[PDB]
From a paper:
We set out to design proteins that can switch between two well-defined and fully structured conformations. We reasoned that these goals could be collectively achieved with a “hinge”-like design in which two rigid domains move relative to each other while remaining individually folded.
To explore whether peptide-responsive hinges could be turned into protein-responsive hinges, we used inpainting with RoseTTAFold to add two additional helices to a validated effector peptide, resulting in fully structured 3-helix bundles (3hb). Hinge-3hb binding was tested qualitatively by SEC and, for hinges which had a corresponding FRET construct, quantitatively with the FRET-labeled variant, and DEER was used in addition to FRET to confirm that 3hb binding caused the same conformational change as effector peptide binding. The 3hb approach was able to rescue designs for which the peptide alone or the hinge-peptide complex had shown the tendency to form higher-order oligomers.
Residue numbers in the entry:
A (entry chain A), B (entry chain B): 2 to 97
Amino acid sequence: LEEEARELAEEAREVRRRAEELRRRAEEARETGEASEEHAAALLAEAAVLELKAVLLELEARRLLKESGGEVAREALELAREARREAREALEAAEE
Amino acid sequence: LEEEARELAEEAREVRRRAEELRRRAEEARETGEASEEHAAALLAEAAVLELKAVLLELEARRLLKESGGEVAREALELAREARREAREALEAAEE
């Protein structure tokens, strides 16, 4: 089970960093004012999907914490939550 | 100055993720014995360097917080500490 939590955590690290990248692209986009509707909607789309992946990873970590209850499942839950939060920020930054 | 903290933050996100990639490689290698002495010493060297980079970004964040106790500078210091900590885990894993 600790190996399942390790794959959950590492997958969360991936979606966090990718949300971090998308958020930066969206923040630079609002400050630049580049109203490339294709680019604005593409970032919005990939940020929305990244969030749904983060929510799925989140609830899967909750399930892996119902069972067991170890620190490795606990850390995998925080990393999923952070990824969810970074994705919601990339979301709201893409709306503008 | 708030743009400087954004750059110090984004740089800390890169160092964090790279420490996450290095650490996973070292744990996977410590678990098995596949790591050659070249590779084991290579992961350690880039992790040690990555650690020093994370200490420099941390201290630069402590300076930025000293100059202005802004929330943007605060989160950048948190991200640098996180990168520092992830780098140190990559160090200890590469020792084995």
